[PDB]
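Why predict the complex rather than its parts? Because the way molecules touch one another can change local conformation, and only a joint prediction can capture that. The input here totals 1498 residues.
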Amino acid sequence: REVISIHIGQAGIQVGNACWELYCLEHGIQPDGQMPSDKTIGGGDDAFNTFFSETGAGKHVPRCIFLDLEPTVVDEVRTGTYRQLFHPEQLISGKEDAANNFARGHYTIGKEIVDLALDRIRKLADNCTGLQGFLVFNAVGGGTGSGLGSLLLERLSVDYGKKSKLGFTVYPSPQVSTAVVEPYNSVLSTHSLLEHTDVAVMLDNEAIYDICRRSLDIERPTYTNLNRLIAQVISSLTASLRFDGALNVDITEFQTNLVPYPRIHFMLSSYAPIISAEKAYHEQLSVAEITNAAFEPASMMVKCDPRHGKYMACCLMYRGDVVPKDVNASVATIKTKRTIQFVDWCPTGFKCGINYQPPTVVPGGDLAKVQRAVCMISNSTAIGEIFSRLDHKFDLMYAKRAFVHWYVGEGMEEGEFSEAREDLAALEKDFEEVGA
Amino acid sequence: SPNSTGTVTQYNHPMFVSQRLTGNFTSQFEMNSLPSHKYETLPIRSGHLPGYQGHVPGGVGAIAQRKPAAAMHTMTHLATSGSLPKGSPQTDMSLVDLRPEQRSMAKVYMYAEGAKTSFLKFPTPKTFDHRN
Amino acid sequence: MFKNAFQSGFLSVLYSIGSKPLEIWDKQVSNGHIKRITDADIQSSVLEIMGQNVSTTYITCPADPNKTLGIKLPFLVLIIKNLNKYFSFEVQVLDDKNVRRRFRASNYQSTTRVKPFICTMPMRLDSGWNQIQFNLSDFTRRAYGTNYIETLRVQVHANCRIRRIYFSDRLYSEEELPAEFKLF
Amino acid sequence: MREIVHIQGGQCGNQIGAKFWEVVSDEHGIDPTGTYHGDSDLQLERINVYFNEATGGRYVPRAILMDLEPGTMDSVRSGPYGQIFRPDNFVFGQTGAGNNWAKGHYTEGAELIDSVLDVVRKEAESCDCLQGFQVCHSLGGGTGSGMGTLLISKIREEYPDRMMLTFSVVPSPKVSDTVVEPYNATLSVHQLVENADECMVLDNEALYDICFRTLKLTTPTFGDLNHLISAVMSGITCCLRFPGQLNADLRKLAVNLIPFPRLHFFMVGFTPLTSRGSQQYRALTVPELTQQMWDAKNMMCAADPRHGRYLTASALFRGRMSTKEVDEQMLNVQNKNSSYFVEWIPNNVKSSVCDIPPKGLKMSATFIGNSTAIQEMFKRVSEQFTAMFRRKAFLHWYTGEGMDEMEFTEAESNMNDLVSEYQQYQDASAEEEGEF
Amino acid sequence: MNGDVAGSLFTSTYRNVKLAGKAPPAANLSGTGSCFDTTSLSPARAGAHKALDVQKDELPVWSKSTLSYKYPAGRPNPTGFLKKGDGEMIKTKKPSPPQAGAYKRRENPPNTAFRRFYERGDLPIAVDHRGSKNMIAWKVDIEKLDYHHYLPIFFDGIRETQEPYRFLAVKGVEDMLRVGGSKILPVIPQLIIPIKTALNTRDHSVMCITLQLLQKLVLSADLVGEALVPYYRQILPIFNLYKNKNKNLGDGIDYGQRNYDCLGELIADTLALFEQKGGDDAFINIKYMVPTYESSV
Amino acid sequence: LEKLRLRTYPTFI
Ligand SMILES: Nc1nc2c(ncn2[C@@H]2O[C@H](COP(=O)(O)OP(=O)(O)OP(=O)(O)O)[C@@H](O)[C@H]2O)c(=O)[nH]1
Ligand SMILES: Nc1nc2c(ncn2[C@@H]2O[C@H](COP(=O)(O)OP(=O)(O)O)[C@@H](O)[C@H]2O)c(=O)[nH]1
Ligand SMILES: [Mg+2]
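Output of the joint prediction:
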């Protein structure tokens, strides 16, 4: 059982840096690439197999590729902390940026690098034997994470077909943004990510800024703090493949129990508890309390209020000292609450998951050693309003055809813009029809 | 007692940052004990509480840190400023965020603001001349 | 309505020659315009829809979004004039499994994509006026294993000159067609 | 990697480029003798973008210095850091333009542009991945405007897919410096509208204003003006040379700043500037940056944004800072005075964070806003030109050299076209029916 | 597409002044003097938009305190002093770019060259005064006329708005376009300036008349379509200004269709016809200037 | 030609 990760763009690579920093600490692998001779903290010689591949004697390289068009972030890893860890031919790098231009990175610049990325990922998959799937990281604001981030998805879909492809996108915030042309890129990315990804997990930057400011009392946060707890969610949802659990859940079960219809795959991640070290040991936290704390809109990492919509199917990941009795007792209390409601045709609802190993800590990070944590992954119609707002502010610009001449200069034409706009509209109609 | 990273390079880190290094800027981790006072992963006796409404000398120092860690880092920044030159820089690796890129302190990542220059050094009337 | 209707071989839902053509249709126009002018090649009044964004300006058949009309007629016929611009139309149907499908024919797409709820088709038009016949039953049989029962709504987008959109039950030829439904 | 080929034309261009090369050579850590004496690894990483390492451990700028006289060449060579320039890049004629566009564009242009083009071809072919051409010049003189315009055109047909920056100073409205200034400026903007990719406009009167009121300098020379413009270039091209949390090259800013192909005449401000007295009393924060950044009084251009709406704006923050403060401040400045921002483009502000500030400063930023109020200078120049031209003042000096009145008439046609197009895009509304 | 562009002049003017009842714009009659004598030509320029907004003192000042622009505080006056009870009234107690007008009408004085040469009397033009709309009594034959000397003059008189001159100018332009054969090609560079000047003024009637006349000019020739493409940089801007001005009647019929008043349809038709004639490398320029245009294959 | 033909007419499975 092995899963390989693809990190695309500035945001994807910066997130994957914290991800691999957390992974190496989970399995006690020093940045040099090997565990120390002493201090065998972990149990089980095959735990690292799903993320690291054991080479020769006393060396384990990660299963990942860092690819981007600007080498100003990739080269920072080459001479940063993990010079020895990553294999040199996994840190792919280009010569020119996409420059926030989906057309550029999808038709002009990504064409000559997608083949190399596919060549590397091919021999990465051959070393594997029990491939569960892929998990990709990118932001849908820029061009590199959008154009070639979707071209690579299409190439993997045509090359492999039945392999699962988890997606963890970073969607533009409703009002707190850093780019201008990002609605175009977001719509064009959603148009092709709809038919190729199997489970896509939305993530909003300001929705995590609020969490850091309020829960973590970080009055000034930054990107690194956000990438720190993104890695926590990834590790929480992947730990069932790594460590034994009372009721485990693999990648194929997420698709089975969270995707009622082939096009409705957009999950709302959440996590609990997000607490600092000062308040962690003062307020006792139970399974029944953390599951309640993982259902408020104030703990959602995407800014869409679940009150505006209805839940289709919820997924719950538990780690630490958790037993089936208290978790399935707490699930019943959630169903009796009236402020949240599920769809009519889903009486079953949740899918629980229990793992024994508690989440590990990042030294110099922001979280603390927590006895038990929850990584909630939902599927509701409240995400229907996000696409509505993105569509509204995309159409507000498309009427004057602003910034269009950049896109048509790289090979695309207005037909793609249209056919993506109607694809988003059709997805909206799907969401209201299913929620009826 | 500033931390001493084992990494060595052609250049030496500037004195305004070498005297101020935390235990988290190490090339090799201590896998046996991650929760320890060295990494500031435990509740801190020093530092003001999150609900503290008083005045802290930091204010704007830390850019990505919680209240107690920021308080410790600004207190250490102000504590050992005597040995530094009078025109010492204001920022520091402790106050500034710890990126996973730069934890090993391999390169000279923060050097500019303490470097002697004339980037915005406009002529004073006593030193003024008309380019004769 | 149309549930208690007679529903003979022919049935019109919008005719450009009348006091209130858009009487049941709900117009929703933004960055566009709707008019009724006399075309220069058929010498008759036509309903003209033109707009910048084809996804914003449209007219749906039932005024009430919740309410739906009921048509058992298999064939749906449109009489459209090609303006050499982006144009599309969408129709809702009900199958024997009691689920709602959608058939969107678009001028600006190349692939033919089949999803459980939406089936998008490409389409190409001639220079001037042309009548298009949809044959909802055949499309329902081809896209899904089910069969056609009912039509729930029809929706036409911008950049088109519309006149005498109607339903039918047989592949009528021009000779056997009644005069009022002809092109000339 | 990415490379910038710098070109200085005429007195103004030569002086500003000399000061720019001095400050940048100090920034990367090389002495006025050209040898490296810096103390940072990050310095060596991106010195190729501006310098070529010659045999012997000495660096030289990638600059070309051009005019029609030897005097300015001698002046730039004699000055500090004048010995770092390669003596083979000192192309200059012997007759002189005489502040005559016709001489610098048709007679002296045709005889000197060959050697300048040969030098530029050599310099650009030497490097591998050209990023773009950066040109500093004026718009009032003959060889600064006429010759530089021809060089820009030739580079355009020779290098049609490369970036192009032009730091062009425009004649001051209230006080001129040359009788035939509108004659040069009309043709200059007529050619810049088609050839250059973007022109960031400067103005000597504005430089005087900022250096007198904010800096509170008693007697400012040309040195501090060229110094400020040099700092502006260092800020705008910062992210190409240093790592940052969020990156932005020339192409990204061009994409995010230009909504329509002819709208590339920007207005620039740099932050922070203060007197020596107030230096010891202010604190370095993102707010105190953004208040001075958005002041219309701080802009170094004659156009006042109070008479128009900001189409798009860009703020290249420098220094290791919190991104949440950045984007929340720009959100606030966009939300408060919303009427001064265009309505049909939401999220008008592009933001970037670089980790290496200039030496001496803890934190700095540069403002590049595309405002529709830029039309006033074009209107004033056009009316001054037509006051010149209605009864033929000083026309014999140009028509007696080959060009006819049709060029002047067509230049006014295009210029009065551009101002009207600015007016149209400023006055347009989102609903689109309210204006009729 | 009208057989005679001037065919609706008198009837439309009379309908506008009397039948519809709306106030007719009566301006730019200053300096024309009387009849039977020369009109004093003003030195003002019709095409140029000499707006030059002067916000000397009402312009708001930027506040470094709060990012919102704020107006300066009012200057206290000795006439209005502090009353006895206003202290409790104190307890019980938005900037914008000014106009930047682009759709306002630009002034056009009657200084066109056509008016000067007509008052001079060197034009062989007379009014038939027929029962139908009046034709032009040409003293000398049209085919032997020197187009180089006359076509710029008549195209310059289209901007003119007073009754006796605009009709003559439009009808003469129509007649020369219809009768002329290959003589139109060499003079096409000289007609750019008058057409641009007529389009610059934001007056509806002149805009629609010059749009129809441009359609006839590009139609009534052999290969002038290939010749107008380099000049698209000076004509299409007004098309961009008024491309989407169109009246929307949800279910009503546009009665004012026999007269080409809605310039939104005229602009689209003119763009399509420009695309048709001389279409080789012609769509690119139109798309470059007009951003929303769609190629008609 | 295939990328145009399978892209201009409606084709099902
Ligand atoms: N959570 C998080 N988001 C980031 C980070 N860095 C960038 N982003 C997001 O990424 C979006 C823009 O894309 P980038 O990551 O900057 O770069 P890109 O996706 O590769 O696109 P280009 O750089 O233009 O080629 C921004 O809107 C940010 O919200 C990060 O470190 N953490
Ligand atoms: N900022 C700056 N502007 C200058 C300098 N020298 C000249 N200028 C400006 O350039 C204009 C004159 O340009 P000119 O010398 O005739 O250019 P040239 O003769 O074509 O090389 C004047 O209006 C000055 O404002 C300088 O050293 N710095
Ligand atoms: Mg990127």
